[PDB]
Amino acid sequence: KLKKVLDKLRLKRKDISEAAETVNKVVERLLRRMQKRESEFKGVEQLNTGSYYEHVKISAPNEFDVMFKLEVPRIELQEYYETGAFYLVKFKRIPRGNPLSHFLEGEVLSATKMLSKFRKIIKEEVKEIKDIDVSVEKEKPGSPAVTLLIRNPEEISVDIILALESKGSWPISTKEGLPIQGWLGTKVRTNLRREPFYLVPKNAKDGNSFQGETWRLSFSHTEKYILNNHGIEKTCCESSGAKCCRKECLKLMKYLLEQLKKEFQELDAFCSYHVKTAIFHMWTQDPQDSQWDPRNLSSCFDKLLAFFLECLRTEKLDHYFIPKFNLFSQELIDRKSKEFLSKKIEYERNNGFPIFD
DNA sequence: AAATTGCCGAAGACG
DNA sequence: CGTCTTCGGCAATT
Ligand SMILES: Cc1[nH]n(-c2nc3c(Cl)c(Cl)ccc3[nH]2)c(=O)c1[C@@H]1OC(=O)c2ccccc21
Ligand SMILES: [Zn+2]
């Protein structure tokens, strides 16, 4: 039953080939345009991230995430109030003349200024693309992405995300996050935390507006690693090991949410990241591969559901990397919204998920 | 050195 | 199930 649903969600290789060919062409051309001189972004390097590259994209290969990461040496972070996730960015000394100087607000590196120039460069390069139907989506306030819309003729969206790369130790708000010590282990956790961390230009929302200069942490690289390396046993899902159902559970939950969001606009505040965060917590709670045997799929999905419902009820979903940051706080999502989603999930749960059709 | 190449894991396709 | 395939990621190579 869930097996038949998984069959429907599975991407098709011909669809993948057609989409990847086009997306790869467009991204490679923008990355190159960025390498151009003058460009304040000259040293940017590409990191593919998100559902498609984690192999948990469902239904159709029509959404691609790509981080353009820029190593910016020696920056100081100032936590924006007590959020743990959002920061003001300053440069330590003064780099004689360096080209991020235009994006400065005196001493602070404005996320909005830098993203605006990045978007402008992308829009200009896109207008010069003639062999492919592609346009830039209208700017979305408080979004770090420049979103491309490709018609292949199928509709494909590509989010291009500027990221600042910093090689220093991770901000202390993350010190008790990534609780993978009983699952993936201490050597993995330590090695993951020696990797760079990233800032993307998503502005903090304080009230009815955004704080234009704030940046937000991103662990898209770390999450991608975990999805590809998700077993307590090193051979989990390898050719000489045993298949588990962890990723299939994630797909089913993404599907349930997406089907619900598509017909109820009361759910606009939710997104796949909430589901991804929930299952990260589930994998920490139930680390044994034996707990995610494919024969147990139904019970794993149900336990994920029970857990997600408890998060909604209690208005608490801790960010997996930043435990202080509650994704389900009143400030971010209204009570009413969480109770609406609770009633809809419970109904689908007790009626055999009719919405899976 | 910016672009090419090689290798192989993940997973879709098929019987 | 096994086998065969393509795509993505990496980094040595030129
Ligand atoms: C609600 C939400 N939070 N969230 C998210 N918040 C993140 C935080 Cl705070 C850190 Cl530190 C790292 C990654 C994070 N991802 C998201 O990525 C989203 C969704 O991504 C969006 O841009 C978005 C937009 C509308 C609804 C949901 C989301
Ligand atoms: Zn596995």
Short mmCIF file of C-alpha atoms (C1' of nucleotides) and ligand atoms in Angstrom, two decimals:
data_model
loop_
_atom_site.label_atom_id
_atom_site.label_comp_id
_atom_site.label_asym_id
_atom_site.label_seq_id
_atom_site.Cartn_x
_atom_site.Cartn_y
_atom_site.Cartn_z
CA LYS A 1 0.00 0.00 0.00
CA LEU A 2 2.65 2.52 1.06
CA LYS A 3 4.81 0.45 -1.29
CA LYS A 4 2.47 1.29 -4.16
CA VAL A 5 2.58 4.93 -3.12
CA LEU A 6 6.41 4.85 -3.08
CA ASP A 7 6.23 3.38 -6.60
CA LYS A 8 4.22 6.38 -7.77
CA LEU A 9 6.60 8.90 -6.12
CA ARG A 10 9.72 7.28 -7.57
CA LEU A 11 11.44 9.51 -10.15
CA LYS A 12 11.69 8.18 -13.75
CA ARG A 13 15.11 7.94 -15.35
CA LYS A 14 14.02 9.54 -18.63
CA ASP A 15 12.53 12.51 -16.70
CA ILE A 16 15.75 12.79 -14.70
CA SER A 17 17.95 12.80 -17.83
CA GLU A 18 15.87 15.48 -19.57
CA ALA A 19 15.74 17.77 -16.52
CA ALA A 20 19.39 17.35 -15.47
CA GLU A 21 20.66 18.08 -18.96
CA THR A 22 18.84 21.43 -19.01
CA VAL A 23 19.47 22.40 -15.37
CA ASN A 24 23.17 21.52 -15.69
CA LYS A 25 23.54 23.72 -18.78
CA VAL A 26 21.92 26.77 -17.13
CA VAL A 27 23.74 26.48 -13.80
CA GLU A 28 27.18 25.97 -15.41
CA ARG A 29 26.62 29.12 -17.46
CA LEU A 30 25.68 31.25 -14.42
CA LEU A 31 28.61 29.88 -12.39
CA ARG A 32 30.91 30.82 -15.24
CA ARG A 33 29.37 34.31 -15.52
CA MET A 34 30.09 34.75 -11.82
CA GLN A 35 33.80 33.85 -12.38
CA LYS A 36 34.06 36.80 -14.69
CA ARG A 37 36.34 39.63 -13.42
CA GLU A 38 34.87 42.80 -11.72
CA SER A 39 32.25 40.37 -10.30
CA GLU A 40 32.36 40.64 -6.54
CA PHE A 41 31.58 36.91 -6.52
CA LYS A 42 34.56 35.73 -8.59
CA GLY A 43 35.72 32.84 -6.39
CA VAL A 44 32.31 31.18 -5.99
CA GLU A 45 32.16 27.41 -6.12
CA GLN A 46 29.15 25.20 -6.62
CA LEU A 47 27.56 22.85 -4.10
CA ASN A 48 24.43 20.94 -5.12
CA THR A 49 22.01 20.58 -2.21
CA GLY A 50 18.48 19.63 -1.19
CA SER A 51 15.96 16.91 -1.99
CA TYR A 52 17.03 16.04 -5.54
CA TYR A 53 20.74 15.66 -4.68
CA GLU A 54 19.89 13.85 -1.43
CA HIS A 55 17.80 11.39 -3.46
CA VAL A 56 14.59 12.20 -1.55
CA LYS A 57 12.89 14.31 -4.24
CA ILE A 58 9.44 12.91 -5.05
CA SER A 59 6.95 12.71 -7.95
CA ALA A 60 8.94 14.70 -10.51
CA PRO A 61 12.46 16.09 -10.94
CA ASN A 62 11.16 19.68 -11.05
CA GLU A 63 13.01 21.40 -8.16
CA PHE A 64 16.77 21.84 -7.91
CA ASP A 65 18.78 23.61 -5.19
CA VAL A 66 22.29 24.95 -5.87
CA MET A 67 24.51 26.86 -3.45
CA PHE A 68 27.10 29.26 -4.89
CA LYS A 69 29.52 29.37 -1.96
CA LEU A 70 32.05 32.17 -1.51
CA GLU A 71 34.95 31.79 0.89
CA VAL A 72 35.12 35.06 2.80
CA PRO A 73 38.16 34.96 5.11
CA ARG A 74 38.11 36.43 8.60
CA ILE A 75 34.67 37.58 9.52
CA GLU A 76 33.16 38.28 12.93
CA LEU A 77 29.66 37.02 13.72
CA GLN A 78 27.26 38.90 15.99
CA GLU A 79 24.21 36.85 16.97
CA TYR A 80 21.00 38.72 16.11
CA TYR A 81 19.34 38.94 19.52
CA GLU A 82 18.91 35.42 20.87
CA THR A 83 17.84 33.68 17.68
CA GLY A 84 20.89 31.38 17.39
CA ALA A 85 20.24 31.15 13.64
CA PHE A 86 20.53 34.76 12.43
CA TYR A 87 23.69 36.92 12.45
CA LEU A 88 25.17 40.30 11.55
CA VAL A 89 28.43 39.94 9.66
CA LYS A 90 31.51 42.17 10.08
CA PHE A 91 35.08 41.95 8.76
CA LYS A 92 37.86 41.78 11.33
CA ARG A 93 40.49 44.17 10.09
CA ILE A 94 40.18 46.04 6.78
CA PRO A 95 41.27 44.39 3.53
CA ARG A 96 42.72 47.41 1.93
CA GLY A 97 40.47 47.51 -1.08
CA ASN A 98 38.42 44.35 -1.50
CA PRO A 99 35.28 44.22 -3.63
CA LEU A 100 32.70 43.32 -0.91
CA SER A 101 33.26 46.89 0.30
CA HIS A 102 30.31 48.09 -1.79
CA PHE A 103 27.96 45.77 0.08
CA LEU A 104 28.96 47.28 3.41
CA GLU A 105 26.85 49.29 5.78
CA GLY A 106 29.90 50.99 7.26
CA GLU A 107 31.04 47.95 9.24
CA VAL A 108 28.27 45.40 8.58
CA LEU A 109 28.05 43.23 5.44
CA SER A 110 24.48 43.74 4.25
CA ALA A 111 22.80 40.52 3.22
CA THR A 112 20.32 42.58 1.16
CA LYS A 113 22.94 44.57 -0.76
CA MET A 114 24.99 41.52 -1.63
CA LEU A 115 21.99 39.38 -2.64
CA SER A 116 20.66 42.24 -4.77
CA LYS A 117 23.84 42.49 -6.82
CA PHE A 118 23.95 38.67 -7.07
CA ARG A 119 20.35 38.63 -8.32
CA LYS A 120 21.05 41.44 -10.78
CA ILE A 121 23.99 39.53 -12.27
CA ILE A 122 21.86 36.38 -12.62
CA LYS A 123 18.93 38.26 -14.23
CA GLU A 124 21.24 39.83 -16.80
CA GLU A 125 22.90 36.51 -17.69
CA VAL A 126 19.48 34.79 -17.96
CA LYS A 127 18.22 37.34 -20.51
CA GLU A 128 21.17 36.28 -22.68
CA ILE A 129 20.09 32.62 -22.72
CA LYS A 130 18.36 31.90 -26.05
CA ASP A 131 18.28 28.11 -26.50
CA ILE A 132 16.40 27.47 -23.25
CA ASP A 133 13.11 28.92 -21.91
CA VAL A 134 14.21 30.34 -18.55
CA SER A 135 13.17 33.35 -16.50
CA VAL A 136 13.85 34.68 -13.02
CA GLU A 137 10.95 34.42 -10.55
CA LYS A 138 9.66 37.60 -8.87
CA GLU A 139 11.72 38.49 -5.78
CA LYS A 140 10.40 37.02 -2.55
CA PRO A 141 10.97 39.17 0.56
CA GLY A 142 13.17 37.50 3.16
CA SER A 143 14.26 34.77 0.73
CA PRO A 144 17.94 33.93 0.23
CA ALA A 145 17.34 32.41 -3.22
CA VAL A 146 17.39 33.66 -6.77
CA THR A 147 14.82 31.37 -8.30
CA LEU A 148 14.92 30.38 -11.95
CA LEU A 149 11.87 29.09 -13.80
CA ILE A 150 12.70 26.70 -16.63
CA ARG A 151 10.19 25.38 -19.14
CA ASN A 152 11.73 22.22 -20.58
CA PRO A 153 8.67 22.26 -21.61
CA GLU A 154 7.96 20.79 -18.16
CA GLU A 155 8.14 23.38 -15.36
CA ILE A 156 11.41 23.14 -13.42
CA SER A 157 12.51 25.48 -10.65
CA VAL A 158 16.14 26.09 -9.71
CA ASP A 159 16.99 27.93 -6.49
CA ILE A 160 20.38 29.59 -6.67
CA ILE A 161 21.58 30.37 -3.16
CA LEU A 162 24.52 32.61 -2.42
CA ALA A 163 26.45 31.40 0.63
CA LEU A 164 29.32 32.82 2.64
CA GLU A 165 31.79 30.12 3.56
CA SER A 166 33.64 30.32 6.86
CA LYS A 167 36.31 27.82 7.96
CA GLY A 168 36.26 28.81 11.64
CA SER A 169 34.63 26.83 14.45
CA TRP A 170 30.82 26.72 14.26
CA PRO A 171 28.83 29.34 16.28
CA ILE A 172 28.22 28.24 19.87
CA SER A 173 24.45 28.09 19.34
CA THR A 174 25.26 24.81 17.48
CA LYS A 175 27.44 23.40 20.28
CA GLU A 176 24.75 21.04 21.57
CA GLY A 177 23.12 20.44 18.17
CA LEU A 178 23.78 17.58 15.71
CA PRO A 179 23.09 14.93 18.41
CA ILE A 180 24.28 11.99 16.33
CA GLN A 181 26.72 10.45 18.87
CA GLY A 182 24.64 7.29 19.49
CA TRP A 183 23.75 6.87 15.82
CA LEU A 184 26.52 8.03 13.49
CA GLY A 185 29.07 8.51 16.26
CA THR A 186 31.55 10.93 17.71
CA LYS A 187 34.20 10.61 15.01
CA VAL A 188 31.56 11.55 12.37
CA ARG A 189 30.17 14.40 14.49
CA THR A 190 33.64 15.81 15.10
CA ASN A 191 34.64 15.51 11.44
CA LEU A 192 31.36 17.13 10.27
CA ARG A 193 31.97 20.06 12.64
CA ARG A 194 35.50 20.61 11.27
CA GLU A 195 33.92 21.33 7.88
CA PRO A 196 33.15 24.97 7.04
CA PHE A 197 29.83 26.52 8.03
CA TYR A 198 27.69 28.66 5.75
CA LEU A 199 25.70 31.86 5.91
CA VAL A 200 22.90 32.55 3.41
CA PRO A 201 21.15 35.88 2.93
CA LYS A 202 17.82 35.01 4.49
CA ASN A 203 16.87 37.99 6.61
CA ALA A 204 15.50 37.59 10.10
CA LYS A 205 11.92 38.81 10.43
CA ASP A 206 11.58 40.87 13.63
CA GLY A 207 8.06 42.21 13.17
CA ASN A 208 6.19 43.18 10.03
CA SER A 209 9.46 43.74 8.18
CA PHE A 210 12.84 42.06 7.74
CA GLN A 211 16.22 43.01 9.18
CA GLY A 212 17.94 43.75 5.90
CA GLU A 213 21.51 43.04 6.94
CA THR A 214 21.04 39.71 8.73
CA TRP A 215 22.27 36.36 7.41
CA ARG A 216 21.18 32.87 8.46
CA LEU A 217 23.14 29.70 9.13
CA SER A 218 22.80 26.84 6.66
CA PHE A 219 23.80 23.20 7.11
CA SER A 220 22.67 22.02 3.70
CA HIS A 221 26.12 20.38 3.16
CA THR A 222 25.94 18.57 6.48
CA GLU A 223 22.40 17.39 5.88
CA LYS A 224 23.38 16.06 2.45
CA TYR A 225 26.24 14.06 3.96
CA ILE A 226 23.92 12.58 6.61
CA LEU A 227 21.33 11.52 4.04
CA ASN A 228 24.03 9.71 2.00
CA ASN A 229 25.56 8.25 5.25
CA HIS A 230 22.54 7.57 7.39
CA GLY A 231 23.07 4.14 8.93
CA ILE A 232 24.54 3.05 12.24
CA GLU A 233 26.17 0.30 10.13
CA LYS A 234 28.64 1.51 7.49
CA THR A 235 27.10 -0.80 4.87
CA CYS A 236 23.50 0.52 5.26
CA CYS A 237 21.94 0.73 1.77
CA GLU A 238 25.24 -0.26 0.07
CA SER A 239 25.62 -3.12 -2.42
CA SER A 240 27.11 -5.46 0.24
CA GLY A 241 24.81 -4.30 3.04
CA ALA A 242 21.08 -4.15 3.81
CA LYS A 243 18.50 -1.66 2.48
CA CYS A 244 16.68 0.38 5.13
CA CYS A 245 13.46 2.43 4.81
CA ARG A 246 14.67 5.73 6.33
CA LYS A 247 14.56 7.65 3.04
CA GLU A 248 11.26 6.09 2.01
CA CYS A 249 9.73 7.31 5.28
CA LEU A 250 11.00 10.78 4.56
CA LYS A 251 9.42 10.65 1.08
CA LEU A 252 6.04 9.56 2.40
CA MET A 253 5.99 12.36 4.96
CA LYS A 254 7.04 14.94 2.33
CA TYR A 255 4.24 13.64 0.14
CA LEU A 256 1.60 13.82 2.87
CA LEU A 257 2.54 17.43 3.64
CA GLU A 258 2.74 18.46 0.02
CA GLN A 259 -0.67 16.98 -0.82
CA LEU A 260 -2.14 18.80 2.17
CA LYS A 261 -0.45 22.15 1.40
CA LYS A 262 -1.63 22.03 -2.20
CA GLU A 263 -5.31 22.10 -1.20
CA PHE A 264 -5.23 24.12 2.06
CA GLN A 265 -3.67 27.59 2.07
CA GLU A 266 -3.97 27.59 5.87
CA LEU A 267 -0.80 25.50 5.63
CA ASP A 268 1.38 28.04 3.80
CA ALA A 269 3.58 28.37 6.88
CA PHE A 270 4.75 24.74 6.72
CA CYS A 271 7.37 23.29 4.44
CA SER A 272 9.47 20.22 3.76
CA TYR A 273 12.22 21.41 6.13
CA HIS A 274 9.86 20.89 9.08
CA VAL A 275 9.40 17.30 7.97
CA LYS A 276 13.13 16.82 7.37
CA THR A 277 13.88 18.18 10.86
CA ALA A 278 11.34 15.84 12.42
CA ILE A 279 12.79 12.74 10.82
CA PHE A 280 16.33 13.80 11.78
CA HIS A 281 15.09 13.69 15.36
CA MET A 282 13.47 10.30 14.70
CA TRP A 283 16.71 8.87 13.36
CA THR A 284 18.41 10.05 16.55
CA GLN A 285 15.70 8.55 18.71
CA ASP A 286 15.74 5.19 16.83
CA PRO A 287 19.35 4.79 15.61
CA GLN A 288 19.44 1.03 14.97
CA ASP A 289 19.22 -0.02 11.31
CA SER A 290 17.04 -2.89 12.48
CA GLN A 291 14.46 -0.28 13.50
CA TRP A 292 14.19 0.80 9.88
CA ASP A 293 13.98 -2.56 8.15
CA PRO A 294 11.88 -2.20 4.95
CA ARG A 295 9.49 -4.81 6.37
CA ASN A 296 8.68 -2.27 9.13
CA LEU A 297 7.92 0.66 6.79
CA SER A 298 4.30 1.08 7.93
CA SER A 299 5.25 1.25 11.60
CA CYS A 300 8.18 3.60 10.91
CA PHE A 301 5.97 6.00 8.98
CA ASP A 302 3.36 5.85 11.73
CA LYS A 303 5.95 6.57 14.44
CA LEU A 304 7.21 9.51 12.41
CA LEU A 305 3.59 10.71 12.18
CA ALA A 306 3.01 10.29 15.92
CA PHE A 307 6.20 12.21 16.60
CA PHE A 308 5.31 15.01 14.18
CA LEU A 309 1.85 15.32 15.73
CA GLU A 310 3.42 15.62 19.20
CA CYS A 311 5.65 18.43 17.95
CA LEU A 312 2.58 20.28 16.60
CA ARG A 313 0.62 19.77 19.82
CA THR A 314 3.45 20.98 22.03
CA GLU A 315 4.41 23.82 19.66
CA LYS A 316 8.04 22.72 19.66
CA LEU A 317 10.28 21.45 16.88
CA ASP A 318 13.92 22.05 17.77
CA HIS A 319 16.18 22.88 14.83
CA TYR A 320 18.43 19.81 14.57
CA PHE A 321 21.65 21.86 14.52
CA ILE A 322 20.53 24.77 16.71
CA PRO A 323 18.50 23.44 19.63
CA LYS A 324 17.50 26.99 20.84
CA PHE A 325 15.73 27.66 17.57
CA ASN A 326 12.13 26.45 17.66
CA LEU A 327 10.74 26.04 14.16
CA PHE A 328 7.21 25.74 15.64
CA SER A 329 7.26 28.79 17.88
CA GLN A 330 4.27 31.06 17.95
CA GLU A 331 6.34 33.79 16.35
CA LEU A 332 6.88 31.67 13.27
CA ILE A 333 3.72 29.62 13.01
CA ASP A 334 0.36 30.38 14.61
CA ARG A 335 -1.39 28.03 17.03
CA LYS A 336 -4.37 27.93 14.63
CA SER A 337 -2.09 26.77 11.80
CA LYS A 338 -0.58 23.99 13.89
CA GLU A 339 -3.98 22.73 15.10
CA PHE A 340 -5.34 22.79 11.55
CA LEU A 341 -2.48 20.65 10.31
CA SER A 342 -2.90 18.39 13.35
CA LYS A 343 -6.55 17.68 12.53
CA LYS A 344 -5.78 17.05 8.86
CA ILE A 345 -2.92 14.64 9.58
CA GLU A 346 -4.98 12.74 12.17
CA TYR A 347 -7.84 12.34 9.68
CA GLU A 348 -5.55 10.96 6.97
CA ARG A 349 -4.00 8.72 9.61
CA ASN A 350 -7.29 7.10 10.64
CA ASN A 351 -8.77 6.83 7.16
CA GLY A 352 -5.90 5.06 5.43
CA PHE A 353 -4.52 8.22 3.81
CA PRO A 354 -7.09 8.81 1.06
CA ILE A 355 -5.16 11.93 0.05
CA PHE A 356 -2.38 9.71 -1.29
CA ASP A 357 -4.73 9.72 -4.35
"C1'" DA B 1 45.22 26.65 -14.36
"C1'" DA B 2 40.23 26.09 -16.23
"C1'" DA B 3 38.60 22.05 -18.38
"C1'" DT B 4 38.96 17.16 -19.08
"C1'" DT B 5 38.93 12.47 -17.44
"C1'" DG B 6 38.40 8.39 -14.42
"C1'" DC B 7 36.25 5.93 -10.89
"C1'" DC B 8 32.35 4.15 -8.53
"C1'" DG B 9 28.19 4.61 -5.28
"C1'" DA B 10 23.12 5.43 -5.43
"C1'" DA B 11 19.31 4.01 -7.49
"C1'" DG B 12 16.03 3.36 -11.68
"C1'" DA B 13 14.70 -0.48 -15.12
"C1'" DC B 14 13.86 -4.91 -16.15
"C1'" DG B 15 12.96 -9.86 -16.05
"C1'" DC C 1 16.23 -10.92 -6.01
"C1'" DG C 2 20.78 -9.64 -10.23
"C1'" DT C 3 22.40 -7.04 -13.71
"C1'" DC C 4 22.90 -3.18 -16.34
"C1'" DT C 5 22.48 1.64 -16.93
"C1'" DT C 6 22.87 6.97 -15.96
"C1'" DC C 7 23.85 10.71 -13.01
"C1'" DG C 8 26.48 12.98 -9.45
"C1'" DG C 9 30.89 13.94 -6.86
"C1'" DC C 10 35.59 14.06 -6.57
"C1'" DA C 11 40.10 15.30 -7.54
"C1'" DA C 12 44.21 13.92 -10.27
"C1'" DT C 13 45.47 15.34 -14.42
"C1'" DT C 14 46.84 18.44 -18.50
C1 LIG D 1 9.87 27.60 7.50
C2 LIG D 1 11.26 27.23 6.98
N1 LIG D 1 12.29 27.19 7.82
N2 LIG D 1 13.28 26.85 7.22
C3 LIG D 1 14.51 26.77 7.71
N3 LIG D 1 14.91 27.46 8.76
C4 LIG D 1 16.21 27.21 8.90
C5 LIG D 1 17.08 27.63 9.82
CL1 LIG D 1 16.57 28.68 11.06
C6 LIG D 1 18.41 27.23 9.77
CL2 LIG D 1 19.53 27.79 10.97
C7 LIG D 1 18.81 26.37 8.75
C8 LIG D 1 17.85 25.96 7.82
C9 LIG D 1 16.59 26.38 7.91
N4 LIG D 1 15.53 26.12 7.15
C10 LIG D 1 13.00 26.68 5.94
O1 LIG D 1 13.96 26.32 5.04
C11 LIG D 1 11.71 26.91 5.75
C12 LIG D 1 11.12 26.77 4.45
O2 LIG D 1 12.07 27.20 3.48
C13 LIG D 1 11.54 28.38 3.08
O3 LIG D 1 12.16 29.24 2.44
C14 LIG D 1 10.24 28.48 3.31
C15 LIG D 1 9.31 29.32 2.85
C16 LIG D 1 7.98 29.20 3.22
C17 LIG D 1 7.63 28.18 4.10
C18 LIG D 1 8.64 27.34 4.53
C19 LIG D 1 9.92 27.50 4.15
ZN ZN D 2 20.03 2.76 4.74
#
